[PDB]
């Protein structure tokens, strides 16, 4: 099978800026690749075939190069209505193959993440259940990492976390993190912290509270 | 002109099989091979196969080989794909696409989700997020709403009926052990809360629930 590799998962810019997306074929497909746009929810939308050419109705800020097994995808004066996420595809021989895809984000300025942690509800704890809930709101890079310490410990067992995408009016991004033990477990322990590293920090955020 | 129109939405439960349908208008339908892809937050695009619609010869990806069968009605310009022995690992999302043999694919259809799962209809049970002890540094104070235990999605929620728009979050579901769990949260001034109340309403309409939850100091 043909590998198409886009290293860059995700790229930041701003609107003006000039950005190329790069995409490699493990073999020599020459010019039978394409370049596909694509925004939450919605469908793929085709924008360059045989690697430089354009669909009609396609801004011409957008321009493919490259043949052979490096292409890459090229935007300049880049738009806010640009701001998606990239796939390419060779489309040379079967089975037919699609990079990972690059997201294009807008660049801001750093922000550190507003932290807030709670603790199981009455209700829960009637239904036998004890979920600790952290948010961790309006922060950039998006990049950011969470950990729970159950009496000094961490825990990774039980945790599901969420991200949001990136705000379309601060371009900032948020995230939940919940951690879910049985009732007794949870009335088991005394000390729960949620944990956060992030670049706006040299220390980790810090937020706990004891049962009772 | 072209345009692929396909069906709506699958939920069944592992074991089964479903068969998604694309509809084609616009052009000469037995002209242009018929593709299929599959979507995942994981796996990202993946290619399953082609059918010329003409004569009805058929490519498959190896990896789906055996999990797919594509087909298509002439007479009704309309193509076809069936997954069988479903588990959670085929839940994504499926598109048909026109193959164009030097233009790659210039139109896809709107897509079809499809969820495998062995859950029932549920409702949701809406758990009140409190700050602990009821407290708060900043000049604001962020309250949460805790959304669990629901089946199928979508679910719909708003801080106060609508009237606290302004600093929301309100984060993706995410599915586990056959059900989904949302979160959201709502930031507002210190004088607001636990002064005023500040309500969660939680709206599940597969199974007809409403739920207005209250977020009260402890």
């Known amino acids: 099978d043909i590998v198409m590799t886009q290293s860059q998962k995700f790229m930041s810019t701003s609107v003006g800026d000039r950005v190329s997306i790069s995409c490699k074929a493990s073999?020599?497909?020459?010019?039978?690749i394409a370049w596909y746009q694509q925004k939450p929810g919605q469908s793929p939308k085709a924008l360059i075939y045989?690697?430089?050419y354009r669909y009609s109705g396609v801004p011409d800020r957008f321009t493919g190069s490259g043949s052979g097994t490096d292409f890459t995808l090229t935007i300049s004066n880049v738009q806010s209505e640009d701001l998606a996420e990239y796939f390419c595809?060779?489309?040379?021989?079967?089975?037919?193959?699609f990079g990972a895809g690059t997201k294009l984000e807008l660049k801001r300025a750093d922000a550190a993440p507003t932290v807030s942690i709670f603790p199981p509800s009455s209700e829960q704890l009637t239904s036998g259940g004890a979920s600790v809930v952290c948010f961790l709101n309006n922060f950039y890079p998006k990049d950011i990492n969470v950990k729970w310490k159950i009496d000094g410990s961490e825990r990774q067992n039980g945790v599901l976390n969420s991200w949001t995408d990136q705000d379309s009016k601060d371009s900032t991004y948020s995230m939940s993190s919940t951690l879910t033990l049985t009732k007794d477990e949870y009335e088991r322990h005394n000390s729960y912290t949620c944990e956060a590293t992030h670049k706006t920090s040299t220390s980790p955020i810090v937020k706990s509270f004891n049962r009772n | 002109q072209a345009q692929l129109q396909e069906s709506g939405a699958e939920l069944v439960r592992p074991g089964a099989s479903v068969k998604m349908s694309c509809k084609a208008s616009?052009?000469?339908?037995?002209?242009?091979?018929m593709h299929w892809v599959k979507q995942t937050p994981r796996q990202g695009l993946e290619w399953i196969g082609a059918?010329?619609?003409?004569?009805?010869?058929?490519s498959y990806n190896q990896k789906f080989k055996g999990k797919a069968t594509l087909t298509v009605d002439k007479s009704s310009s309309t193509a076809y794909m069936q997954l069988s022995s479903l588990t959670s690992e085929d839940s994504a999302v499926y598109f048909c696409?026109?193959?164009?043999?030097?233009?790659?694919?210039?139109?896809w259809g709107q897509g079809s989700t499809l969820t495998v799962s062995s859950a029932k209809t549920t409702a949701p049970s809406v758990y009140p997020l409190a700050p602990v002890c009821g407290d708060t540094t900043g000049s604001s104070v962020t309250l949460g709403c805790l959304v669990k235990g629901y089946f199928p999605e979508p679910v719909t929620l708003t801080w106060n009926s609508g009237s606290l728009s302004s600093g929301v979050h309100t984060f993706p579901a995410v599915l586990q052990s056959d059900l989904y769990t949302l979160s959201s949260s709502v930031t507002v001034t210190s004088s607001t809360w636990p002064s005023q109340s500040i309500t969660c309403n939680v709206a599940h309409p597969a199974s007809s629930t409403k739920v207005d939850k209250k977020i009260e100091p402890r």
């Open positions: 059918i010329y619609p003409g004569n009805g010869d058929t």
């Open positions: 696409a026109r193959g164009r043999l030097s233009l790659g694919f210039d139109y």
């Open positions: 616009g052009y000469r339908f037995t002209s242009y091979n």
């Open positions: 045989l690697a430089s």
């Open positions: 595809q060779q489309y040379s021989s079967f089975p037919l193959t």
């Open positions: 073999q020599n497909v020459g010019n039978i």
